[PDB]
Amino acid sequence: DLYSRYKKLQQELEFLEVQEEYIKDEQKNLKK
Amino acid sequence: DDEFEEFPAEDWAGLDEDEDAHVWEDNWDDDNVEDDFSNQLRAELEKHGY
Amino acid sequence: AAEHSQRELDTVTLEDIKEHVKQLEKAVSGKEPRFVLRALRMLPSTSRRLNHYVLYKAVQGFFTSNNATRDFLLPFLEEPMDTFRPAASTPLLPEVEAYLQLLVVIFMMNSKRYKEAQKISDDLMQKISTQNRRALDLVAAKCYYYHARVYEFLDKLDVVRSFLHARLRTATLRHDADGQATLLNLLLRNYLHYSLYDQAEKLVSKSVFPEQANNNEWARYLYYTGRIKAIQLEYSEARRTMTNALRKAPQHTAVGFKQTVHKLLIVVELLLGEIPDRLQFRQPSLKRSLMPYFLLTQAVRTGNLAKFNQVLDQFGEKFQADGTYTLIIRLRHNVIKTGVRMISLSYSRISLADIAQKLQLDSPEDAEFIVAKAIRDGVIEASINHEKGYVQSKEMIDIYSTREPQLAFHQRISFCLDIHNMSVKAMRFPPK
Amino acid sequence: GAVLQAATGMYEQLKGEWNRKSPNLSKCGEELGRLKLVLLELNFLPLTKQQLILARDILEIGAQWSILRKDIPSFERYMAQLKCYYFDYKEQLPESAYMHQLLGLNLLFLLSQNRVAEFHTELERLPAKDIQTNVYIKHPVSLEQYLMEGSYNKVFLAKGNIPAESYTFFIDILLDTIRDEIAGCIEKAYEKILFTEATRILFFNTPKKMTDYAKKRGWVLGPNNYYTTIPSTELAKQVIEYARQLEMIV
Amino acid sequence: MITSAAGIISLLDEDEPQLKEFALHKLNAVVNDFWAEISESVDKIEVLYEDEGFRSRQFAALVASKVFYHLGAFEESLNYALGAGDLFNVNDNSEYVETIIAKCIDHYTKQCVENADLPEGEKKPIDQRLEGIVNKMFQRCLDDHKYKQAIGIALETRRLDVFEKTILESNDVPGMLAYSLKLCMSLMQNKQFRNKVLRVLVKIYMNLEKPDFINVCQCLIFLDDPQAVSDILEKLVKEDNLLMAYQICFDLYESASQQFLSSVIQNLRT
Amino acid sequence: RQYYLSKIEELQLIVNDKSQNLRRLQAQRNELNAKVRL
């Protein structure tokens, strides 16, 4: 319940970070 | 926005009469004391000749 | 006739407050901060009306879950005898109940009734001490501010210090900004109100203000720290901060705020030697209010001890009324440094006998001591040649080819780059 | 109760020996030591009005004894505790006749170690009706106004205008404070200063004293008795930072 | 009523220890009112703490702990809060107590994972006080009967002993076993700790009075332990529960790898 | 117990901030990719 929600929150933040770095790299390559 | 009611929102008394209510905006050197111009020159110049 | 207009205004205020409440619910919907400052931004304008019929209708419409918290306002509330839920028994959002209790408090406040407002504000904070939701943090900031407004006219600010300290620490732990800013400003006012300037200064040094805090709270904090360092003798940073705050001060409202800030910036400036601009002594909203301080500045610029003494004897009540009587003591004792300041700005070199003649110092050694004290501070840049008697100022080297423009430009361009970066981060595209 | 009445008589004896022309410092010292030790048991700081009168008088006699004993590090602590005991939130004890005396003493002490900001705060603390009226603080305010205006010679004239004998103790050390401040002012005001005029304005009547105070600093006598680049790194870091803020997306 | 801490910090400079005890009691009474004045005078508190001859160095440690808790130097606040000892009433609901408890949990989890990944020869020792106080969180959670939260904290802290105890003493053994299995499969990533946790649930499953051999076999397939499942199948064969054996083997065929099935067959053959 | 809720709300605010930022970055990449495709 509480702990599972905490784990899902941390996992979603991690996935958000992956998407963030991917989008930055793709932005650089698209600018080129 | 906060009106800063912590500060008493100072009422300007009873919105009484101002000094002149002019559009004549002045500077800090317009409130000094001077004594005309001709007298300045002469009274300062008889010590040397006029 | 009057009842018809009153009923129409009650209905339009009911719809506006309904918009506020719906705005709280669609702000708690979407799980996001903001859109609640869109709720609280115009509580002054709606609190302008605050009639009894509209408040009672709102209470009966949005507190359909009749609780003891609704049954505590009802005794003091005067409900209309003859007199809307936008509809099931879904439990009330705590943000909604806090906001509704807030408007109830403010109506009960503007009617010059304080003690019951004191109790009701206390019960508002006793329940807000139980919630741990960021949606009830921006609301809670304004609840705290209006609560301290309730308490201020009841002359019981000292008892609130413990609560404000605890909630400020709670905000700092939760990284709150609006609540933190409101509590910090309010507690600085608490410390200065009981003349705990040392305590306020010490608190300031170990407390970092959030950069994201709203403009008005930032201006309040800047004013408070500026007063602290002005009575703490940090005049240069003082004037810098009050100039910043006046740039952040509202143009239309906060007449009392701008008046106090203008008064303290005037005294800080002429303590540092700077002469306040005459135009700020000309706007109608400030003219007669600064008229005591305007005569103060006239005496300061003239520098005659006779008119100075008469101005002091005539306006000392105004001087202490702002907590500036000691400030004006230092003012009366720094007018001489001010005089030396224009003397040295006008003259590249000047004999100390000439200094005593133009300043009425009656002694070359007295002039030497006074000018040495003045030049100790960063008021006058010179190079005293006691071999001959020169007060030869430093060569005004070209500001260009001196790296000073490079540093100033670096700071400014960094400011523009941060502005651009924050703007591009604040694009905030919507989902649909 | 019983300990409180015993301490009442005990500090009656304390002040009785103390107000005697020159109290035997050891007796009253051990007395007030054990007296504060038991005052910890008599509810030191927050209450019977006589209890706070007792504790406030303990600290007042202790502070004036520090004047008499001539110890500053303890003097500051007696100052702070009895400041928590003089005039802040107390309001139940009768106005001590010895309030303003030590407000002035503490202000002068604070000036003695270059604490003008803190001193000004303490000036703000006390009421406005007394700065220009109460002589126990008119002597501080007059002297410090003369200090701030730079009229040091006015201080040299008024050093004897103290309102009570319990001022000269740090009137002397204020006299040394002003002279060291003045010496710093001359050092950062002049380029070269002659031996004779330096001896004249350093307020060291003994020329030997002036020479010792000159050796104490690096400001030296002089032969005839008469005392940038392009860093290209931080600015380069700045331009690289600008390029960084242009690049690397938002 | 008090107005500042100047009197108290001035009392702090005094020499006799008992007056220091009284002043420390007053500081602990009011450090949430005016922290700033003692914040600049915390060096006295540190030199008070580091003295061995003090009879109450723990109280100085606690005072400095609260001071640093205000200061935001939560690292030194945690240091001198662990230095407080038993006077840190865990059962207290103080905000300082609560936040230092949370930071104790965070530091313990960080230390636990950084010691778990590292080999045995390089394990930095965990402080005894933080281990005991976090054990007091598990005990307090069990007394409050928030068993899921204790399970989660144990998984965060790599404490298989606390996890095993929490599952054993939990009121609902099968439901908590299922919740732990779902969490372990769907949410945790570290493979070696995953194997250790799966072995823990396997042991609890087999020691359970009516072993949920479907879940045990699933965990064994996830663990790749053909010998254990072969022995369990032999146990089922000798125990006559043939329906268990049939459903288990069908599950292994549907789920386990070809190598796993071939190895199990070879073990069943021998 | 309350520690769990505090961590959850902190992670929730961080996640909201990062999701809003990711939406902004996705929009920027969308317009730039549209320009490249055109």
UniProtKB/Swiss-Prot annotation, chain A:
It comes from the Eukaryota. Belongs to the AAA ATPase family. Component of the 19S proteasome regulatory particle complex. The 26S proteasome consists of a 20S core particle (CP) and two 19S regulatory subunits (RP). The regulatory particle is made of a lid composed of 9 subunits, a base containing 6 ATPases including PSMC4 and few additional components. Interacts with NR1I3. Interacts with PAAF1. Interacts with TRIM5. Interacts with ZFAND1. This is 26S proteasome regulatory subunit 6B. The lineage of its organism: Eukaryota, Metazoa, Chordata, Craniata, Vertebrata. Component of the 26S proteasome, a multiprotein complex involved in the ATP-dependent degradation of ubiquitinated proteins. This complex plays a key role in the maintenance of protein homeostasis by removing misfolded or damaged proteins, which could impair cellular functions, and by removing proteins whose functions are no longer required. Therefore, the proteasome participates in numerous cellular processes, including cell cycle progression, apoptosis, or DNA damage repair. The chain holds residues 39 to 70 of 418 of the full protein. It is found in: Cytoplasm; Nucleus.
UniProtKB/Swiss-Prot annotation, chain B:
Coiled coil: none annotated. Keywords: Nucleus, Proteasome. It is found in: Nucleus. Expressed in limb bud, craniofacial primordia and skin. GO terms for biological process: double-strand break repair via homologous recombination; mRNA export from nucleus; proteasome assembly; proteasome-mediated ubiquitin-dependent protein catabolic process. It comes from the Eukaryota. Belongs to the DSS1/SEM1 family. Component of the 26S proteasome, a multiprotein complex involved in the ATP-dependent degradation of ubiquitinated proteins. This complex plays a key role in the maintenance of protein homeostasis by removing misfolded or damaged proteins, which could impair cellular functions, and by removing proteins whose functions are no longer required. Therefore, the proteasome participates in numerous cellular processes, including cell cycle progression, apoptosis, or DNA damage repair. This is 26S proteasome complex subunit SEM1. It comes from Homo sapiens. The gene is SEM1. The chain holds residues 16 to 65 of 70 of the full protein.
Curated annotation (Swiss-Prot), chain D:
One of its GO terms (cellular component) is proteasome regulatory particle, lid subcomplex. It comes from the Eukaryota. Transmembrane segments: none annotated. GO terms for biological process: proteasome-mediated ubiquitin-dependent protein catabolic process. Signal peptide: none annotated. The keyword Phosphoprotein applies. Keywords: Isopeptide bond, Phosphoprotein, Proteasome, Ubl conjugation. The modification Phosphoserine is found at S22. The keyword Cell membrane does not apply. There is a cross-link at K208 (Glycyl lysine isopeptide (Lys-Gly) (interchain with G-Cter in SUMO2)). Residues 73-231 form the PCI domain. Component of the 26S proteasome, a multiprotein complex involved in the ATP-dependent degradation of ubiquitinated proteins. This complex plays a key role in the maintenance of protein homeostasis by removing misfolded or damaged proteins, which could impair cellular functions, and by removing proteins whose functions are no longer required. Therefore, the proteasome participates in numerous cellular processes, including cell cycle progression, apoptosis, or DNA damage repair. Belongs to the proteasome subunit S14 family. Component of the 19S proteasome regulatory particle complex. The 26S proteasome consists of a 20S core particle (CP) and two 19S regulatory subunits (RP). The regulatory particle is made of a lid composed of 9 subunits including PSMD8, a base containing 6 ATPases and few additional components. Interacts with DDI2. Interacts with TASOR. This is 26S proteasome non-ATPase regulatory subunit 8. It comes from Homo sapiens. The gene is PSMD8. The chain holds residues 85 to 350 of 350 of the full protein.
UniProtKB/Swiss-Prot annotation, chain E:
GO terms for biological process: proteasome-mediated ubiquitin-dependent protein catabolic process; regulation of protein catabolic process. Component of the 19S proteasome regulatory particle complex. The 26S proteasome consists of a 20S core particle (CP) and two 19S regulatory subunits (RP). The regulatory particle is made of a lid composed of 9 subunits, a base containing 6 ATPases and few additional components including PSMD1. Interacts with ADRM1. Interacts with ZFAND1. One of its GO terms (cellular component) is nucleus. Coiled coil: none annotated. Belongs to the proteasome subunit S1 family. One of its GO terms (molecular function) is enzyme regulator activity. The keyword Acetylation applies. The gene is PSMD1. The modification N-acetylmethionine is found at M1. Component of the 26S proteasome, a multiprotein complex involved in the ATP-dependent degradation of ubiquitinated proteins. This complex plays a key role in the maintenance of protein homeostasis by removing misfolded or damaged proteins, which could impair cellular functions, and by removing proteins whose functions are no longer required. Therefore, the proteasome participates in numerous cellular processes, including cell cycle progression, apoptosis, or DNA damage repair. Keywords: Acetylation, Phosphoprotein, Proteasome, Repeat. This is 26S proteasome non-ATPase regulatory subunit 1. The keyword Repeat applies. The chain holds residues 1 to 270 of 953 of the full protein.
